[PDB]
Design an enzyme around this catalytic site. Structure first.
Site, PDB file in Angstrom:
ATOM      1  N   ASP A  60       0.128  51.951  74.737  1.00 31.28           N
ATOM      2  CA  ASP A  60      -0.590  52.026  75.998  1.00 31.28           C
ATOM      3  C   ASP A  60      -0.742  53.488  76.328  1.00 31.28           C
ATOM      4  OD1 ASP A  60      -1.444  52.018  78.672  1.00 31.28           O
ATOM      5  OD2 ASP A  60       0.232  50.768  79.387  1.00 31.28           O
ATOM      6  N   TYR A 161     -15.649  53.173  86.787  1.00 34.98           N
ATOM      7  CA  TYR A 161     -15.883  53.577  85.420  1.00 34.98           C
ATOM      8  C   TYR A 161     -16.528  54.950  85.389  1.00 34.98           C
ATOM      9  CZ  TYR A 161     -17.433  53.065  80.577  1.00 34.98           C
ATOM     10  OH  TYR A 161     -17.638  53.192  79.194  1.00 34.98           O
ATOM     11  N   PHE A 194     -23.547  50.718  73.067  1.00 31.82           N
ATOM     12  CA  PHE A 194     -23.190  50.467  71.680  1.00 31.82           C
ATOM     13  C   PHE A 194     -22.705  49.042  71.505  1.00 31.82           C
ATOM     14  CE2 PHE A 194     -23.051  54.332  69.056  1.00 31.82           C
ATOM     15  CZ  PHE A 194     -23.646  55.186  69.975  1.00 31.82           C
TER      16      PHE A 194
HETATM   17  N1  LIG Z   1     -19.617  50.144  73.793  1.00 31.13           N
HETATM   18  C1  LIG Z   1     -20.345  50.884  74.730  1.00 31.13           C
HETATM   19  O1  LIG Z   1     -21.502  50.555  75.006  1.00 31.13           O
HETATM   20  C2  LIG Z   1     -19.737  52.154  75.321  1.00 31.13           C
HETATM   21  C3  LIG Z   1     -20.636  53.089  75.907  1.00 31.13           C
HETATM   22  C4  LIG Z   1     -20.155  54.232  76.454  1.00 31.13           C
HETATM   23  C5  LIG Z   1     -18.779  54.537  76.392  1.00 31.13           C
HETATM   24  N2  LIG Z   1     -17.875  53.633  75.832  1.00 31.13           N
HETATM   25  C6  LIG Z   1     -16.460  53.935  75.760  1.00 31.13           C
HETATM   26  O2  LIG Z   1     -16.159  54.034  74.266  1.00 31.13           O
HETATM   27  C7  LIG Z   1     -14.807  53.863  74.123  1.00 31.13           C
HETATM   28  C8  LIG Z   1     -14.629  52.804  73.099  1.00 31.13           C
HETATM   29  O3  LIG Z   1     -14.951  51.536  73.663  1.00 31.13           O
HETATM   30  P1  LIG Z   1     -15.543  50.328  72.735  1.00 31.13           P
HETATM   31  O4  LIG Z   1     -16.994  50.029  72.961  1.00 31.13           O
HETATM   32  O5  LIG Z   1     -15.095  50.534  71.344  1.00 31.13           O
HETATM   33  O6  LIG Z   1     -14.779  49.063  73.373  1.00 31.13           O
HETATM   34  P2  LIG Z   1     -13.677  48.062  72.718  1.00 31.13           P
HETATM   35  O7  LIG Z   1     -13.223  47.167  73.874  1.00 31.13           O
HETATM   36  O8  LIG Z   1     -14.208  47.436  71.469  1.00 31.13           O
HETATM   37  O9  LIG Z   1     -12.521  49.004  72.188  1.00 31.13           O
HETATM   38  C9  LIG Z   1     -11.622  49.599  73.164  1.00 31.13           C
HETATM   39  C10 LIG Z   1     -10.176  49.600  72.637  1.00 31.13           C
HETATM   40  O10 LIG Z   1      -9.410  50.177  73.631  1.00 31.13           O
HETATM   41  C11 LIG Z   1      -8.121  49.400  73.699  1.00 31.13           C
HETATM   42  N3  LIG Z   1      -7.451  49.738  74.929  1.00 31.13           N
HETATM   43  C12 LIG Z   1      -7.773  49.385  76.198  1.00 31.13           C
HETATM   44  N4  LIG Z   1      -6.866  49.863  77.091  1.00 31.13           N
HETATM   45  C13 LIG Z   1      -5.954  50.509  76.325  1.00 31.13           C
HETATM   46  C14 LIG Z   1      -4.816  51.180  76.644  1.00 31.13           C
HETATM   47  N5  LIG Z   1      -4.251  51.308  77.914  1.00 31.13           N
HETATM   48  N6  LIG Z   1      -4.065  51.753  75.663  1.00 31.13           N
HETATM   49  C15 LIG Z   1      -4.483  51.678  74.353  1.00 31.13           C
HETATM   50  N7  LIG Z   1      -5.603  51.017  74.010  1.00 31.13           N
HETATM   51  C16 LIG Z   1      -6.315  50.436  75.000  1.00 31.13           C
HETATM   52  C17 LIG Z   1      -8.564  48.119  73.604  1.00 31.13           C
HETATM   53  O11 LIG Z   1      -7.529  47.153  73.275  1.00 31.13           O
HETATM   54  C18 LIG Z   1      -9.645  48.151  72.473  1.00 31.13           C
HETATM   55  O12 LIG Z   1      -9.152  47.857  71.197  1.00 31.13           O
HETATM   56  C19 LIG Z   1     -14.244  53.498  75.521  1.00 31.13           C
HETATM   57  O13 LIG Z   1     -13.670  54.579  76.141  1.00 31.13           O
HETATM   58  C20 LIG Z   1     -15.557  53.036  76.199  1.00 31.13           C
HETATM   59  O14 LIG Z   1     -15.348  53.194  77.653  1.00 31.13           O
HETATM   60  C21 LIG Z   1     -18.381  52.480  75.242  1.00 31.13           C
END
Ligand SMILES: NC(=O)c1ccc[n+]([C@@H]2O[C@H](COP(=O)([O-])OP(=O)(O)OC[C@H]3O[C@@H](n4cnc5c(N)ncnc54)[C@H](O)[C@@H]3O)[C@@H](O)[C@H]2O)c1
Ligand SMILES: NC(=O)c1ccc[n+]([C@@H]2O[C@H](COP(=O)([O-])OP(=O)(O)OC[C@H]3O[C@@H](n4cnc5c(N)ncnc54)[C@H](O)[C@@H]3O)[C@@H](O)[C@H]2O)c1
Ligand SMILES: NC(=O)c1ccc[n+]([C@@H]2O[C@H](COP(=O)([O-])OP(=O)(O)OC[C@H]3O[C@@H](n4cnc5c(N)ncnc54)[C@H](O)[C@@H]3O)[C@@H](O)[C@H]2O)c1
Ligand SMILES: NC(=O)c1ccc[n+]([C@@H]2O[C@H](COP(=O)([O-])OP(=O)(O)OC[C@H]3O[C@@H](n4cnc5c(N)ncnc54)[C@H](O)[C@@H]3O)[C@@H](O)[C@H]2O)c1
Lengths: 255, 254, 255, 255
Positions: A60, A161, A194
């Site tokens: 975490d 966010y 994404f």
């Molecule tokens: N997918 C999109 O469209 C998008 C766009 C802009 C930014 N983001 C950001 O990209 C990053 C990756 O997100 P993603 O799309 O891969 O989502 P995702 O949900 O597939 O992956 C996020 C990972 O973070 C883990 N996680 C959550 N809280 C946690 C914590 N306290 N400690 C450790 N791990 C934790 C989750 O278990 C998960 O495996 C994030 O920061 C997200 O906010 C995503």
């Protein structure tokens, strides 16, 4: 010596069990890097570690002890040259909603995971990287964090966010300045939209419709395209103290 | 032509000192009634007495304190403005002499400056949303304080810069959220201002800093921050924006 | 399948005889690209085109007929897949100098070369690229232009240069929006301080001291490091409508 | 002592025959300032200057001699304390249209009026203000220019306008830096959508629909509201080197 070598160096990736973190893990492994995956999701994290030949650490990102354990696993594996912060959550709630004000704890939790968590991983990893010998291009290490276009284009429902992600973006420069004497570069990527499990509960129709709103390419981003930009950050000695939008030129509207 | 300050109520966090105090004075001179929300009982009650307003002891990070401060305002009259000035500005490097930046110091800065500002906004917005619109259309206006550190964060400012960048970055989505409620949402990003926040910085260092400001070559006065607040309340077109108020300075690493 | 191919495609590079444009030409040629160099400098441009097995066109980017000639040379050579705008000048003059106001013609000339010239090249090249069949990744082509950190951090004496480069940076988004239906991506790089002949008038000592002001790495940028980022832009299908600072985290002071 | 006096001082307003310039002129006059209106529109400029008890000068902001005449008229009238640059045009044309690329002249003309023209007026007015004795607050004068949200949010068809207005925005900081020793503040206003003759040829339904897109207030801006912000900039000694969006929180979409 033209750039930092990925091959045989260690990369700690938070959120590495899924989505952008997982895609980054895959690309760095294909390039010969050794990955430590830090995530809450033990089943997916262990599975990906087995697929890639990396290490999984249940972590975490908001907790001091967990950041310490993740960084120590990476330093035990080899020379920690990169941190990639991908752990994050993206809840939605309006400042004033149908049930009254945005709950306080929801805002706090979003800030705690996304902003405080990212800083927590940075501070611990940076302290460890500062003990490295410099690579031939001069870097002891490089830190990459994930913001979002919501740092700039926050939508209705994204106050928390956006705040968290603008926090991440805004701290890039002072951290780069802090770590310049340690020869650690600090960068942020602000992805648009994404295709990852972050979008679970967006019906497929609505996802395709959102992809169609992206100027070019008219689709959701692939995790590999995020990963590609992470690699460029690692490999380009001049990229520091900056936030890069990776978004097909979209600008997000209120709805 | 614009939302009138005269007769309306303005809730000012950090209102016992510095920029919040300055804002309180100017808004009172314009005929507004102020609620000062601050940790500092002694300075807050004095100033509220001087201005014929109300003081509420309020830790902006606490839900119940936010509710009490907003309640004080709605009791006093029609709540038309929130000005968030409560904040702290610790210094600590990401990696110090003795190890990494302490986690609690980072969390504390974020909690006061960012979570606290949001906590006040959400409660005050809910109350403002129940108002009848003013003749120019607004139910209310929210102004928050970021900093040039949102953009120009210096060595040792990672926590402050994160917190202030957060405040700056949420201006737009909150404006979007509240557009149906006819509440405008703005942010001021001050440069360097002569307030008790600079206690500890000795006089020679403050004067040297003033001399680095392109024009005017001095520290900002609280009344100057307050002037911009008043323009924001009075200008119906200012929404969803962050304004630097800094004499054109850009902060260097050191 | 994963990115636009540089090999055997044609790249038109303005300012290609020197500095960043020349470094870009070298890297794209190493990657198997075929370059057209467009520059005022006949002797250096012809010599570099010969060395790289490309084509030189003597071209003032501000002239319609020169842009047309440069684009025609590219489309003869093969499939025009990229434009890199590096043609530029960087005079210095204060708004109010010792002898009176900044001369009007110096401001106009700066804007004409750097801003009007870049747009001129973009519009003609984009019209050509729009007639291409899309690549496998979907792009008909990709346009990269060069702004400067002066777009954001303009120094005393840099009003003209800053205006011009802020104009280049600010038009990235509307041009990306204009060309989204043509599947042409549009990006901008904003370099900090790079070791090129643009710095001819700055003494070695002042160059070294300015290098020492860059947080990390504490040196001037290499043309290759600019080139590396251009390559990333070409190869990453999600990079669109954005401006990327490439500057070692420096922020330029008034002096 | 708290701020610069508008009463009995002189303000030079370009584009002052119409729209935002006219609204500015009115407000400054009502506060006791004396205006010089500089515009192409002889009949409307002379009439408004009469209405306001000020002076009109036929002035093409792109011409050195016209800038000089307009500044001369202001210094003859009294102590020139402010310049407000509102002269501008907003044509539309896509980078690649149905018939070929964006005409070069249309881009060049937009840049010439909006950007070169604004700089021309600044340099001449600044040279004149630099000769003033400081006001009690310390200013010799204050310069306000008009960019647009198109500096940041440029739409399809706005490449030229966006380039020009991003240029104006981006030169704010170096010009403030240049003029700091002269005690002249330099600021920019970036308006969203305002009810002026600039929108002539947008039919009323399209105007009403666009007002409805402004998050709050859901309408076009009034010239008075622009003018109110100009007055705040004149009266606030700490506003320098900055661009202020005045736009009801709108973010402009591609179409
Ligand atoms: N997918 C999109 O469209 C998008 C766009 C802009 C930014 N983001 C950001 O990209 C990053 C990756 O997100 P993603 O799309 O891969 O989502 P995702 O949900 O597939 O992956 C996020 C990972 O973070 C883990 N996680 C959550 N809280 C946690 C914590 N306290 N400690 C450790 N791990 C934790 C989750 O278990 C998960 O495996 C994030 O920061 C997200 O906010 C995503
Ligand atoms: N003075 C500057 O140079 C400067 C520059 C940029 C931004 N700021 C910001 O302006 C705002 C006002 O700062 P100031 O200069 O007036 O400082 P100040 O110290 O004079 O006043 C801040 C007030 O905030 C109160 N406060 C602190 N934590 C609080 C909490 N949890 N709940 C309620 N009140 C709390 C304090 O008791 C104090 O009265 C802050 O947000 C500051 O970060 C100041
Ligand atoms: N070197 C730096 O520190 C730096 C930093 C930021 C941005 N830039 C920008 O990078 C780009 C490349 O600059 P550089 O450092 O390689 O400088 P350089 O002087 O080495 O190369 C510039 C080239 O542009 C050519 N050129 C000038 N005007 C021309 C015109 N009208 N038509 C065609 N060619 C023309 C020149 O002949 C020259 O070969 C420029 O746009 C520059 O403003 C440079
Ligand atoms: N109306 C809007 O929605 C809006 C939004 C953002 C920015 N702006 C900008 O605000 C400023 C004022 O525009 P407006 O809305 O009042 O439009 P307007 O057309 O009503 O007024 C513009 C004035 O500029 C004059 N002008 C044009 N070219 C000139 C030149 N070469 N020299 C001298 N004067 C010249 C015109 O004759 C006219 O009187 C412009 O810079 C405009 O681009 C307008």
């Amino acid at each position: 010596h033209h750039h930092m070598e990925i091959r045989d160096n260690v990369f700690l990736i938070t959120g590495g069990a899924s989505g952008l973190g997982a895609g980054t893990a895959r690309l760095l492994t294909e390039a010969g890097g050794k990955v430590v995956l830090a995530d809450l999701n033990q089943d997916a994290g262990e599975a990906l570690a087995r697929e890639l030949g990396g290490v999984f650490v249940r972590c975490d990102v908001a907790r001091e002890e967990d950041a310490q354990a993740a960084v120590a696993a990476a330093t035990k594996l080899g020379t920690l040259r990169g941190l990639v912060n991908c752990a994050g959550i993206a809840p939605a709630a309006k400042t004033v909603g149908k049930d009254g004000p945005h709950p306080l704890e929801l805002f706090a939790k979003t800030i705690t995971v996304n902003l405080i968590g990212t800083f927590n991983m940075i501070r611990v990893a940076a302290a460890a990287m500062a003990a490295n010998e410099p690579a031939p291009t001069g870097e002891r290490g490089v830190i990459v964090s994930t913001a979002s276009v919501a740092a700039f284009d926050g939508q209705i429902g994204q106050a928390a966010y956006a705040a968290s992600k603008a926090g991440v973006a805004g701290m890039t420069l002072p951290i780069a300045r802090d770590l310049s004497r340690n020869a650690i570069r600090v960068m942020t990527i602000a992805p648009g939209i994404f295709e990852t499990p972050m979008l679970l509960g967006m019906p497929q129709e609505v996802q395709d419709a959102l992809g169609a709103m992206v100027p070019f390419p008219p689709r959701l981003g692939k995790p590999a395209e995020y990963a590609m930009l992470v690699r460029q950050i690692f490999e380009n000695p001049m990229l520091n103290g900056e936030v890069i939008r990776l978004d097909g030129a979209i600008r997000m509207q209120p709805k």
